[PDB]
């Protein structure tokens, strides 16, 4: 009876079970207690293995992989704070739906709360942020393998969205010669080992029914709001709203083509909000709305009914409107509630939106971050994808740019953390294999700086733009008090990123003008490597430029 | 009734209450939801403020400050994944006793579970790892200020060791002019505002009683095991064990002067374990024993009684011996249980230890990490302190070096995470103002790389030795299969650290021999700045040198 | 490898371990899954076994035993809702400190969440209400017996107060021939089996330090408030306050002799409140103060310092005064802070207390519940003890009677549940062997009615007075709205208790006047049995009488 061998048979059942639920990517950090899990995964030919030394970055790498692939993505870490570092990505997945399967090695129960090295209390340490939590018992042949495979199958099969924490205690010895221990225990499962389905198939679907009064509401004065959704969903929603004749307020994350662009500006104009008061229903598809003026308009508007369609569960309207919360695949939902051609009812807002875009176009020349956002369309890689960071970049693009319909945009806009953007971008790139443009701020790039290691391996060109305004300049846009703004809010670090690029052998450009930025991009798309482009700009120009465009358009 | 003003009065009560329990250092990360806490702290003259952009590093900075200063240390972060990043340091503090007071700003309850940006479930998110958890209510004048201060005073007053999670929801508006809203609410507390004491004094002491049969047991054949303790405590334990005539097995963390050095080697010798079988009692002071051979001997020994004296609560013997678990300040415990002069009963172990050290000296010449550990006394700054990283460095120093009695050693040997070593060393340096030698591995340095930002501000010279053996070479010691060793265990990243140091404008050396290392040190001690010394060594030389020395000493 | 036998050896280690921490009484409910625990308990001769069929009642029986004996009391229930029924007594123990050890049998992990009969999720099902929770692992010889005993030893050894939940999963077969499986596993513990000590002695004492400025504060104008404490402690507190010349406000639970009786009445008089605002310090010993006027005076008074001395931990002043919380054995605390002989400073309150008592005595004649309460001192059994139920009985006794110093009083005044009073009283009687007077209301008697089964076995006479005012007439005392008062507050059940008594073969009396009541008492004290005395009174006479006395005394 080799405990080491049986540990690995147990682990093998876990990993093999995960392959029956679409787990292809597995992100592994180093350790010894994780040996049963890590070796079982290394020997399993279904997996693509990714490795990293920072478990926080590892969780975000998995998050980007799951985010793009729409499949569950596995993680293996050893016991201790390695497990805790998964918390940020797990929380994000809890908000936006990524299926992260966290296999967290643990000490056996006899070694907890007795002063053993690298042993902590792991069951339940993520509280309610996992969708499902499994604390596996101490491995033993007296618990049949069909129990273990059934537990995994229940968790993955019923997983609508979010993370799964599977705590995996293993007792030492962890190494030794692998004999027959556990083989007949495994072979109890018979030809399941040669099958391609779960041992237990439990996959109920969670979805809202057709709205039987839709033929009434689609003829009222409605507004369509498009939040985060897939690229194809964005094109379908644009066509649907156009057909209804309802104005479409389209978020940077919507990939609708934003037919009424610069909503963050023109929603600040009284003629627009006055026109939107006529709306009798608001139908929102997707969530995590980006722009400040849009969140204020949502909070203040009073349609008779407010609907939010999304495949995420729970309430998504932070203003708590009377109305409906409809759980569905958006494309399914649109087919279930088709539009019928009706003439448009807005007259003032299309003109305001065009005038707003003209007001931004008037200011495109300065080599600043607002202008980079406004012009970002010109740098999108063909057949590529955009990963947009948090703080000012996503806000400025949403307010100032009109992104093409169906061009994929990815982001971390659940909790909007600045702590994993580089490694998330790495996973986003690796999952699809597409050329990738990623744009982040300086503090964000410092936060996830060691994920540049991961960016040394990309399967297609990845451009990382670091906007360096020397601090978190979103807080210059906020009414912070001037006496404490720098030390306690902006926190300028006074760095550049050429030495960072050189450390990880990444190409680097610090362009001084539009010509040099173009040159840097043209060089960058030529090889499957990461190029770091640092755009150094004056601290508060971007925030000021947005405030000024905001005032101007409000006076139209 | 300005929400903004009252928010700031509420927060002001929280921070001022913390000043009555010795909180002096406060570590602050940037954010908007945290504005009430951050501004209250910025206005309160009792605090020393430290700032950082990475909240994981922020937590470890607080941990090092608290570890050295023995004072409770406060942290302020904004809502979201920023809170989750505190989990590693919080867990470590729960193991080794540092008092971290985490003021975690939160959205108000009406903005939880409704799709609100940067809003997550924060109460209870640290599960059972905080010593105390306080989920403060939504601020309101209808709850009296004496409840708020009384709750904080209860948490801080009863805090024997570990972290306190104080979750602080605040509703917007967060900014505005300070009017008199909440002023009379504050003035309910009277002249407590001019006092220097808690509003409620609740400070019961948790301490074990004097052992009435101690005069019986001190006459038996005992062994003293000295784990992590204060420097003064290490010296007192040395004198105490010497007077009793009992052998002292002294950990690298013990600061006892290790009179039987290289215990990790001679404990592998059957004559040593045979002599130690004669011991009728083992009295261990401190815990988190470092060495493998020591943990194995502790696991196998069967004294009549095994005692562990420590100010940490709970079980500390991972082998679960029959015996006693005594909660006490170690110096206090020694005074309550004095030694009586007795002739020593060990004869063979002193000789074995002298031979072990001589065998190590025979190998001191190679420019390797085993030799660096062995020779490390030659580089300790006068009246300074040593911060020792995890994995091979602490193990090699413990096995191969004899550190001087009472010279301060610091570490993160609770969970032994490699995720916060640089920011912890920064806090350790700032707490004492002493010149500091910190030594970490390459993967540890990459893990906490951005904490080089913090090392741009030290009050005395800090030498950071980064031992670069290209991966986690502690894992070459385990019998992992060679087929997966590099990719799935060692994870070499193939970097150097010259550009990291240059990025943060820190002096850098890559010495090639002992004299160049001496030159680097002499350069480093001249100014109160951080110097990065990268020691490049071959992958497995250190590990296999330790194995060979173990075989040699074990066959003596 | 008999699973049945090993289950029983694992259980045997658990029970034997408890005998080393003073567990003498064990309360057992019937079941099959609990067989290992139950049979281990039955063959262990250290225990006194009590049985009951209602697990809620069983927990309260354990609570009464622990409440009197001040020793830990063990409980065994089987899996399922039986475990949930322990919650009330566990919560009460969490407030007032009884050490109830809950051994809750469980299904093994492979039978959780799979549709198995009588299997529920039991780990953590009591949330934070146990002082300590242990979720034992699935029994196996691969976890050594020293681990199990050390876990129990940690839990019991550090238990200052409150409950311990020990969840004990067992896999079938539960029955079978008892062979040698697990015998050498037990024997690893050596002669620990013949010992009388814990395997691990871990017993730190939690106690507040001596107040170094006590000689300053005892010379000021103080008030002594005496809450729940032991009978001895009540006598010592009376002597101490008398020595200081400080007024003593003595609760019904204090056993101080209440030298200023009827505080619930004279505290309503403004001359008392005005004189009491001269007080510079209030020293309260014990907690769970009974009377409304006393709670109101505590809420409004503002001494310079407010101290609460008690052996219960945590805050105990629901008004959150500036002052001190001091954790100590109350008698020890008085010896550490002795009184000094000083002239009394109150003049008006003694006159008021005397006049108030006179006002109550003027109304002693009517055959009502207020008069029974007022006259209860004249009926206490010699060398006996009083168990006072919740709602009006304890309020009226506290307001209207003067109980003798040092005469034992017991109650459930933590959460003041009306759900376990009869079974608690049974435990109170069985623990001390003393003749017992227990007084409850009609709804309270219905709540725990089947606990009449337990009252068939008492070791000395127990009188159970059931005051039948046809509903919860405390809700006639509150300003409830009259239109809904009967159906939704009073809830009269219109029963008597003659047939209940008859069902359990208990002697029964329904006295119609004082003479018949005294005859009933005289009959009852002659034999070691339970006699039920039902006192039928008109619904609102007690509540109104108390209101009238309050108004009258308030105008003196
Ligand atoms: C892990 C964590 N911790 C702290 C924060 C708080 N937080 C922000 C949110 O408030 C902004 C959410 C949003 O975009 O809506 S923004 C921000 C500064 C960003 O600095 P930058 O990269 O230089 O970019 P710039 O501001 O354009 O100059 C911080 C520090 C966080 N989000 N996540
Ligand atoms: C946050 C987290 N995540 C993962 C781990 C697992 N873990 C280790 C545990 O074995 C440490 C037990 C010990 O320190 O004795 S060591 C180690 C590699 C260290 O690489 P290095 O700095 O180059 O040093 P070297 O090995 O001497 O070459 C890892 C990755 C962890 N501890 N903490
Ligand atoms: C398990 C549970 N559930 C409900 C309650 C609420 N509760 C009470 C407490 O609130 C009284 C607070 C106190 O005593 O300080 S009293 C009470 C009615 C009692 O009726 P009775 O026995 O006929 O006695 P009488 O009112 O004097 O005639 C109820 C129903 C509870 N305490 N516990
Ligand atoms: Mg910035
Ligand atoms: Mg290394
Ligand atoms: Mg009643």
């Amino acid at each position: 009876m080799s405990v080491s061998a049986f540990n690995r048979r147990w682990a093998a059942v876990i990993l093999e079970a995960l392959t029956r639920h679409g787990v292809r990517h597995i992100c592994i950090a180093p350790g010894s207690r994780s040996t049963p899990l890590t070796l079982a995964a290394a020997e399993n030919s279904a997996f693509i293995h990714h490795t990293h030394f920072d478990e926080r970055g590892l969780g975000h790498l998995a998050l980007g992989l799951a985010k793009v692939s729409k499949q569950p993505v596995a993680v293996i870490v050893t016991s201790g704070t390695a497990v805790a570092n998964l918390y940020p990505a797990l929380i994000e997945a809890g908000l936006t739906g990524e299926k992260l399967i966290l296999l967290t090695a643990d000490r056996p129960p006899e070694l907890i709360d007795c002063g053993a090295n690298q042993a902590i209390r792991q069951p339940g340490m993520f509280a309610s942020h996992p969708t499902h939590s499994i604390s596996l018992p101490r491995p033993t042949q007296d618990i049949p393998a069909r129990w273990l495979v059934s537990t995994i199958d229940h968790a993955l099969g019923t997983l609508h969205a979010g993370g799964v924490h599977i705590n995996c205690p293993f007792a030492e010895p962890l190494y030794g010669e692998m004999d027959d221990t556990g083989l007949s225990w495994q072979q109890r499962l018979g030809d399941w080992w040669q099958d391609d389905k779960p041992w237990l198939r439990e996959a109920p679907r969670l979805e809202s029914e057709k709205q039987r009064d839709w033929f009434f509401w689609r003829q009222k004065r409605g507004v369509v709001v498009a939040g985060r959704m897939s690229a194809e969903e964005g094109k379908k929603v644009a066509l649907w709203a156009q057909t209804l004749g309802w104005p479409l307020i389209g978020d940077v994350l919507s990939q609708t083509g934003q037919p009424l662009p610069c909503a963050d500006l023109w929603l600040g104009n009284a003629k627009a909000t006055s026109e939107l008061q006529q709306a009798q229903i608001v139908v929102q598809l997707g969530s995590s709305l980006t722009g400040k003026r849009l969140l204020q308009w949502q909070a203040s508007c009073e349609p008779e009914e407010y609907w939010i369609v999304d495949d995420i569960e729970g309430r998504l309207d932070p203003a708590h409107h009377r109305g409906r919360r409809l759980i569905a695949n958006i494309a399914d939902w649109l087919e279930l509630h088709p539009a019928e051609k009706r003439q448009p009812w807005c007259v003032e807002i299309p003109r305001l939106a065009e005038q707003a875009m003209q007001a931004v176009i008037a200011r495109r020349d300065a080599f600043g971050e607002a202008q980079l956002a406004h012009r970002i369309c010109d740098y999108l890689p063909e057949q590529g994808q955009l990963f947009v960071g948090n703080s000012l970049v996503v806000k400025l693009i949403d307010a100032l740019s009109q992104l093409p319909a169906g061009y994929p945009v990815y982001s971390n806009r659940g909790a909007s953390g600045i702590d994993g953007l580089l490694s998330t971008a790495a996973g986003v790139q690796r999952a699809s294999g597409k050329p990738t443009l990623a744009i982040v701020g300086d503090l964000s790039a410092l936060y996830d700086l060691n994920a540049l290691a991961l960016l040394r391996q990309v399967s297609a060109p990845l451009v990382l733009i670091v906007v360096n305004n020397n601090g978190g300049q979103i807080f210059s846009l906020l009414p912070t008090p001037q006496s404490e703004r720098e030390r306690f809010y902006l926190m300028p670090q006074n760095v550049h990123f050429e030495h960072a690029a050189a450390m990880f052998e990444l190409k680097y450009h610090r362009p001084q003008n539009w010509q040099e930025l173009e040159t840097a991009f043209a060089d960058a798309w030529r090889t499957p490597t990461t190029t770091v482009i640092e755009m150094v700009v004056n601290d508060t120009d971007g925030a000021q430029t947005l405030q000024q465009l905001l005032a101007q358009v409000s006076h139209l």
Side-chain angles (χ1 to χ4, degrees), chain A residues 235-270 272-301 303-347 349-350 352-353 355-381 383-479 481 483-506 508-514 516-525 527-548:
Chain A
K235 291 187 285 179
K236 290 161 170 197
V237 166
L239 178 61
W240 185 79
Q242 180 184 223
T243 301
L244 291 156
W246 296 1
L248 172 51
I249 307 179
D251 200 81
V252 57
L253 309 183
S254 71
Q255 309 142 128
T256 52
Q258 299 176 295
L260 300 172
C262 308
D264 193 54
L265 309 184
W266 58 256
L267 278 169
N269 185 289
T273 47
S274 175
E275 187 163 65
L276 290 175
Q277 265 155 4
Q278 298 191 277
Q280 298 162 286
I281 176 177
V282 178
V283 176
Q284 180 188 306
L285 303 103
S287 46
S288 293
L289 305 179
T290 294
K292 178 154 175 272
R293 255 59 55 186
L294 174 55
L295 288 166
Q296 284 174 333
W297 177 75
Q298 162 174 249
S300 70
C301 74
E304 168 166 15
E305 294 200 12
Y306 199 106
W307 299 8
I308 289 178
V309 182
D310 205 345
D311 215 10
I312 294 167
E313 305 168 58
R315 295 194 294 111
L316 299 173
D317 171 12
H320 323 289
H321 285 95
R322 195 179 182 179
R324 306 178 205 198
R325 175 58 195 107
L326 304 171
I327 289 74
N329 174 276
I330 285 173
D332 293 357
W333 192 91
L334 291 173
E335 287 183 15
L336 203 55
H337 307 79
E340 272 300 19
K341 189 70 182 49
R342 297 250 306 171
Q343 278 296 276
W345 62 270
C346 277
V347 304
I349 275 165
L352 275 175
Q355 293 175 341
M357 182 65 278
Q358 293 292 351
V360 179
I361 287 170
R363 303 190 62 168
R364 71 188 300 274
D365 282 316
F367 192 63
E369 61 177 317
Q371 285 81 11
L372 174 65
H374 158 72
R375 302 165 65 148
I376 202 61
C377 183
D378 309 324
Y379 306 104
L380 297 175
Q383 311 256 61
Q385 58 201 11
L386 178 70
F387 184 77
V388 66
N390 292 321
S391 207
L392 280 176
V393 50
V394 69
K395 173 177 275 272
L396 288 175
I397 293 177
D398 179 57
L400 308 181
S401 185
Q402 185 184 42
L403 300 181
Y407 192 109
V409 182
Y410 299 96
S411 65
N412 288 345
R413 296 300 299 173
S416 296
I418 65 156
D419 48 326
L421 293 170
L422 278 195
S423 42
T424 303
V428 162
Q429 194 293 311
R430 293 188 188 179
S432 69
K434 293 178 169 177
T436 299
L437 176 57
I439 312 178
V440 307
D442 51 289
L443 296 188
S444 304
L446 286 166
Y447 210 136
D448 203 14
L449 186 71
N450 64 27
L452 293 174
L454 294 167
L455 294 173
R456 298 180 297 182
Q457 297 190 14
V458 288
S459 61
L462 188 146
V463 172
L464 173 64
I465 291 185
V466 179
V467 177
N468 195 346
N469 55 27
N470 204 26
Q473 296 298 339
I474 194 159
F475 301 125
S476 294
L477 193 68
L478 259 76
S483 315
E484 280 76 46
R485 180 163 324 189
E486 171 171 316
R487 187 179 184 194
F488 299 104
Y489 288 89
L490 303 175
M491 305 200 183
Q493 302 298 307
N494 298 287
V495 298
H496 295 295
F497 295 82
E498 68 277 19
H499 286 293
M503 171 169 185
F504 298 96
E505 302 189 271
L506 303 178
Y508 173 84
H509 302 274
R510 188 177 326 180
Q512 312 281 98
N513 53 52
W514 295 114
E516 286 176 10
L517 182 60
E518 182 188 77
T519 299
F521 269 102
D523 184 308
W525 302 123
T527 83
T529 59
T530 293
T531 299
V532 179
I533 300 176
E534 167 167 18
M535 197 194 180
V536 178
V537 302
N538 288 324
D539 40 13
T540 63
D541 285 34
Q544 297 212 7
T545 299
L546 174 73
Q547 283 162 330
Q548 293 164 7

Side-chain angles (χ1 to χ4, degrees), chain A residues 44-59:
Chain A
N44 196 313
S45 61
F47 294 134
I48 300 168
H49 311 90
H50 319 262
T51 66
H52 194 36
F53 54 83
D54 182 328
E55 277 97 13
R56 183 181 67 197
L58 187 84

Side-chain angles (χ1 to χ4, degrees), chain A residues 104-121:
Chain A
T104 69
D106 196 7
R107 260 68 178 162
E110 65 266 20
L111 279 177
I112 302 142
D113 297 329
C114 60
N117 182 64
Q118 201 185 328
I120 68 170
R121 291 185 299 274

Side-chain angles (χ1 to χ4, degrees), chain A residues 215-230:
Chain A
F215 286 24
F216 168 76
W217 284 106
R218 66 177 185 181
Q219 309 224 124
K220 305 284 93 179
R221 297 178 302 264
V223 181
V224 180
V225 179
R228 179 191 49 241
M229 62 191 66
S230 84

